[PDB]
Subunit: 872 residues, 2 copies
């Protein structure tokens, strides 16, 4: 039949026959790109070899030799002649790019006479014999099976013998010698057969090898069995070699169709005369800007320019191209969508849309959503970062570049910042009492605490850098000094944090500011046009809200209420409630917080101006609101007229073997309804009042945490409804409200249909859901997850990336089941995964109404959502 | 149409029309039982009333009056005549027995003249006017709506006025008075209408009321909407009244067809002449044995005897009957399957099979499986238990009656038991070091620890009583004394425990011994014939095994391995391993346990004699194997040449926020494979050797705890297989083995299909599964579960009874999915639920291969299984 196709005789649709490489080479040849000319041995020729019992059909060989003759005629010179020798590259390629890799052999055709003609033409004998000796080795390794060892020993001998120190320091005369030693090895392995001197023996050997290598053990067997059986094989691509060091009319270069750092249209790049690509990357000789090529060789410049524009137009996006000029003849070695940055991605996309080269849809889909984080947090010279001294590392709690003078107390950091200094707050951990200092800091570094720690969460809300859980640190509070890595640091000593990698740097050089871009804003709008998912945010204060809404947030998916009991002015009321011994004494202590909490609630609604807000009732156990220090325990006993013991008895009574699965959330409302009632009163009055005050309508959303059973929710629901309806009566209002639940307990997802019968909405708390589905606590998972990631047990952080295969099932289910009893059931996600692109896309596909993420990730979600809608 | 049926004109198949009561009355009338004669107003008559706008059709009324005339003719006396007045009972009954109850009115037909004839006939005027005044009240309450209050005030007045103290102390002359006061109240509520003096007005009133009461709010609306709509209603049953206090030829009695305490065939019971049932129960007059009735009234005795046997034969089981003789005329008021005990249940069932009255299948199904626990643990006079002084209560860890002298140390209890004393071990908690004392104790009482505590588990294995988690106790170790409830108790002071209720009793009177019964053994065999589920047991030592197998266990579903590291002679090796800082130093420390553990394993296989055993690898975190006391921490530092600090740094390093979801189980093998290898070595050599030693074949089963992901298991599986196959080589054996996993992590159940690809069997660890599905820790659940049970949130302990609706789903799923990849996949259950009848039945239905429970529950499972097979 026909087992050999020239690149001009194929296209992308003959992928099956020519392999993925072969067809792509053909494609680019049709595009008028002067690729080094060649042909392809078909994947059917790989099938015929195996059906001939490891003996290539004379037919095939002949058609290979025929195509070889064709190449020679084009190139004007034979295969290994003495004047201008033809050399080729053999590359293997299947229908698919796949796990378990393919082979590449360069300089095929070299021999004892071709090596000389090559040295004459290049004017560099050292370069000629260097290539020969490499070819000899690579051929012997791939074609036959002579180990590198035999060759590596001899190179180590000669280098060591001549007192030289590296793979390079060899003279032309030494490579000549080494090449003969190498040939001797092949002969000393092939029962006295000389190194494939025959250019044709070389070719075939390489063609045989390629087909042969498809039948080897592991990678191979897996790919055939699982993927798709039938008649798969592998193609062999044979291509002419190029050179840009043959003289003053010869060169090599690399250029971009557009500027990869800024995104400005127009050729950008470099090149060198009489050199190979290596020499360009090496910069020993100052590479000359691409545009100067018009001065040296206008003819080639012109051709170059045209084809570049043709490439850009065909691929429809900024191309990164490698080129080589051989004795006034232009060749193109490689082309690919060039690399760039977030600001650049946007800018180019926009341009591309305005130039009419791409659609808006396409612009949106092609931008890497995770990159957008770059636009929001400052960055100092990437050279200065690599030039920076790493003294440790930890968890990247909140992204950003932070740099400033270190201080060890919230007040000293604030006071220092107020004097005009860049401040870095270093503590064991933070608390709500240190909030004022946190805000004034450029960053925050903690000794203990994970992603969910007090420092990590508050810092994401404030859009402030945060590196947490750095155990290597050793703070000396009294001295105001801390040890890490190479030395101790005192108050005022500058440091640098990388909130994106978790890296901590010794020194003082501030980053820049957070840049904006219309292109950003333009993309957002396009994103909006396409997305279906509304995006809400997780916010606990007005500031955070405002920033979130500034970045497109449509409301609050999760409003935590813990702080409203934690703060200095509140904690006394909760504490008192905790240590009381009467339902009446509890209710009284709790009423004393209403004003303070209602006042918090007002402010939120003020800031949301009609946007919805999901409020999560009290989620953690009472254990956390009681003092853990004999000092505070004493202070409190003093304040309520109790003994230090009696308080201590209460504290230990509250002690729980596994606080993650104790008396908390819904289970706490069940025992002490008084808590819920109070939170309901505060919320409901807060809304009603702001409604009257502005006429802005409000629909409060009340969310019950840690629900696992229908009747459970119903107990609590009843309480809240009775109270809400009371507050309505008292202020004569008709305000609508909704009660829903968190789905963070596997059971709740399994019986979602029953749960829905009461719950008006479902919020997936995928944090606590993941914990329980996998059966581990985030805070204790560090001490093996690392070992798991190494061992490839897990390829992704399940707390950072939603686990679709396992956790996903429950979510999907929960939704499907919820809508069976309540068709118009709204479902969102409020975990950290809500700002994870792949997670969002899942959420889209399974049918959620919205996602919720930290304020400064809203943009990534917004985009992510739009992509998911377009991908499905 | 026809709206009134006499009892002789119905049967069980006309349930729809006559209601459940009406049809059952008819049935028993066909059985030749001289029931007080009557009729039934149909449920269609309830429909016609509602379709007539609350006005009874003359048709219906007439057919009621017609049936009334019929009753009168039978009874020979009119409705409220002056000589021998006819009185009736009105009872309402629907097609179904249901939630939300029906009404009963007695003595219908009483009035100002009938009350006199009644007092004359009975010879007891106080009894006559007492009934009148009650009727007057009950009628006014039910028929009209006069509250009890109006009547209760007047009774309280007269009682208080006459200086009497109770509802009884009234004279005939005072009841006469009170009846007139009562009539005045009705007249003073019914706009001057006299108390329904007319016997017919009374009847109708009661008939109207019944139909009326079907339309009331809650219970009613729920039952109609959900259950089954169409044309439901309620029937009215009207029945003649009886009396056994009319004279010396009149009486009342209660008898059993067989002895309810021992199960011996033959009439058993009591009776009284000239009395009502009350008087029998009262025992003021010494009731005369039933068999003496033949002396008083032979004619009635004879009739009685026949009908009793007829009843027994019809219902096909020991009947408990109430009877009344009125002036030489025998009537039967009630019959039901009499009550009995476990030993009695068996004995009667067996008898019933031998007498040919029931099939074997039927015998099996009718025995209450949970009762069987009575046969295994001794019990002292139930009077003495109620006569016993309760000083506290706690959790019923291990059932039994324990009574003995208290001791506070394992050694003192043993030493005391060795001298011949009944011992009761009271500690804060137990440990493996106290095992010798535990065995020697009649019971065990602990201050802390739940059902899964060290005392609860070891005591179930040993079949020893155990009441755990009694926080009220205050042990004084040095003094050897402890406070609870009313007083402090010293060493030697006797106490009593109830391992079935958790009750603790002050005193010294031992129970009896554990009785056996062929009937037991006979039932087991019948059970075997029917069950499909094999039953295995959870056992950690040979003794336990032996007892389990003695009670029918077919092998070990779960063999815990924790103790093999915990014990005094082992703990040093684990400790050393823990504090090591080298893979090599870990491996060496672990090898030192092989002999001790292999030696444990040998003994098990010795005891199992070919029966299979599932071995669970190390499940708890390393934190538990390290010393928690500065003393021991110091001792260990001394033993390994470390500082007290350095040990303390290691201990705190291992500290975990939530130990239930930390670095343990599979996750521990992942990091420290060395542990698994060692456990595999020990197991594999242990099996091989015993195999050679006896020729008894063995198939070791190796079970990995806390698996959540396919590749996770595979990592560990590889390790174990490499090692097992080594040990095989080393001893030149061809012994088969299987590796499976525990399914206690929700995820594992969700991806069971993937997990199965490696796991050769699945064991449901429904303990840890429930914890995680519900999202709570058993140990912390006490402080609200109580509140949940009260509030009817949960009607069952999910740790004691499998939660089919929620947890069940995962199990079911796990099985279905596992068998998709591995059809011949064996699945068992090893949690506490394995000995819970309803759980077993689930396990049966979803397809498990076997169940596993604590040795002394094997019998309940065996039975339970047989029932499930017959029920499905």
């Amino acid at each position: 039949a026909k087992w050999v196709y020239k690149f001009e005789e194929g296209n992308a649709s003959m992928r099956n026959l020519l392999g993925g490489k072969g067809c792509n080479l053909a494609e680019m040849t049709i595009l008028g790109m002067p690729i080094p000319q060649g042909f392809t041995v078909t994947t059917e020729a790989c099938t015929e070899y195996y059906n001939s019992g490891k003996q290539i059909t004379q037919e095939i060989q002949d058609q290979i030799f025929e195509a070889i003759t064709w190449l020679e005629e084009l190139n004007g010179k034979k295969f290994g002649d003495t004047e201008d020798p033809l050399l080729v590259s053999v590359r293997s390629g299947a229908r698919a790019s796949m796990p378990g890799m393919m082979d590449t052999i360069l300089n095929l055709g070299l021999n004892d006479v071709a090596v000389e003609g090559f040295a004459k033409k290049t004017g560099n004998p050292r370069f000629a014999y260097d290539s020969y000796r490499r070819f000899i080795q690579m051929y012997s390794d791939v074609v036959m099976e002579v180990p590198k060892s035999h060759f590596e020993k001899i190179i180590d001998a000669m280098k060591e013998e001549k007192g030289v120190h590296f793979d390079t320091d060899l003279t032309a005369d030494d490579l000549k010698e080494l090449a003969e030693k190498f040939k001797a090895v092949y002969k000393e392995a092939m029962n006295g057969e000389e190194f494939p001197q025959e250019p044709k023996d070389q070719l075939m050997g390489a063609v045989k090898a390629v087909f042969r290598s498809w039948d080897n053990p592991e990678a191979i067997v897996y790919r055939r069995m699982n993927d798709i059986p039938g008649d798969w094989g592998t193609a062999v691509n044979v291509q002419t070699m190029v050179f840009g060091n043959k003289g003053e009319t010869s060169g090599t270069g690399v250029a971009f169709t557009r500027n990869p750092d800024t995104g400005e249209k127009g050729i950008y790049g470099r090149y060198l005369i009489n050199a190979q690509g290596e020499d360009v990357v090496a910069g020993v000789r100052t590479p000359q800007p691409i545009t100067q090529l018009e001065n040296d060789m206008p003819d080639c410049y012109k051709q170059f320019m045209d084809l570049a524009m043709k490439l850009e137009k065909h691929f429809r996006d900024m191309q990164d191209m490698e080129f080589t000029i051989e004795e006034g003849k232009l060749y193109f070695l490689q082309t690919r969508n060039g690399k760039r940055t977030a600001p650049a991605a946007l800018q180019i996309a926009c341009d591309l849309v305005d130039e009419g080269m791409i659609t808006e849809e396409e612009a949106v889909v092609r931008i890497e959503a995770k990159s957008l984080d770059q636009l929001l947090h400052p960055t100092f010279n990437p050279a200065a970062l690599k030039a920076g001294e790493v003294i440790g590392s930890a968890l990247p709690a909140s992204p950003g570049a932070a740099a400033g003078k270190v201080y060890f107390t919230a007040d000293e950091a604030k006071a220092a910042h107020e004097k005009g200094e860049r401040v870095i707050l270093v503590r064991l951990e933070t608390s709500p009492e240190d909030i004022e200092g946190m805000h004034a800091a450029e960053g925050i570094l903690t000794v203990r605490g994970g992603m969910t720690s007090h420092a990590a969460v508050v810092a994401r809300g404030m859009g402030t850098c945060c590196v947490s859980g750095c155990g290597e640190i050793k703070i000396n509070e009294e001295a105001k000094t801390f040890e890490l890595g190479g030395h101790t640091f005192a108050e005022g000593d500058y440091i640098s944090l990388d909130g994106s990698t978790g890296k901590i740097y010794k020194g003082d050089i501030e980053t820049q500011e957070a840049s904006v871009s219309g292109s950003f804003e333009r993309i957002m709008v396009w994103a909006d046009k396409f997305r279906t998912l509304k995006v809400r945010t997780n916010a606990d204060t007005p500031e955070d809200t405002l920033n979130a809404v500034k970045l497109g947030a449509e409301g609050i998916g999760l409003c935590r209420t813990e702080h409203m009991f934690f703060e200095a002015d509140r904690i006394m009321k909760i504490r008192k409630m905790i240590l009381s011994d009467s339902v009446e004494a509890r209710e009284e202590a709790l009423n004393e917080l209403i004003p303070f909490q209602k006042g918090d609630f007002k402010a939120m609604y003020k800031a949301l101006e009609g946007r919805p807000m999901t409020v999560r009732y009290l989620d953690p156990p009472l254990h956390e609101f009681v003092p853990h220090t004999e000092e505070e325990q004493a202070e409190l006993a003093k304040n309520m007229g109790l003994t230090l013991a009696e308080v201590k008895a209460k504290v230990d009574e509250l002690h729980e073997f596994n606080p993650m699965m104790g008396h908390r959330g819904c289970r706490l409302a069940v025992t002490y309804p008084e808590i819920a009632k109070m939170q309901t009163r505060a919320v409901m009055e807060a809304a009603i009042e702001v409604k009257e005050e502005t006429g802005i309508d409000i629909v409060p959303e009340i969310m019950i945490p840690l629900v696992g059973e229908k009747k459970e929710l119903k107990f609590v629901k009843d309480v809240v409804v009775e109270v809400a309806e009371q507050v309505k009566k008292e202020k004569g209002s008709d305000m609508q409200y909704h009660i829903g639940t968190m789905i963070e307990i596997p059971r709740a997802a399994l019986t979602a249909d029953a749960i829905a019968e009461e719950a008006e909405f479902f919020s997936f708390g995928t944090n606590d859901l993941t914990q329980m589905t996998f059966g581990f606590s985030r805070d204790d998972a560090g001490k093996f997850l690392d070992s798991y990631y190494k061992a490839k047990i897990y390829e992704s952080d399940p707390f950072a990336r939603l686990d679709q295969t396992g956790v996903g099932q429950l979510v999907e289910m929960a939704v499907k089941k919820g809508r069976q009893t309540r068709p118009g059931l709204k479902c969102g996600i409020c975990g950290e995964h809500g700002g994870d692109p792949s997670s969002v896309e899942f959420c889209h596909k399974v049918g959620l109404n919205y996602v919720s993420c930290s304020p400064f990730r809203v943009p990534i979600a917004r985009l992510a959502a739009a992509q998911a809608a377009l991908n499905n």
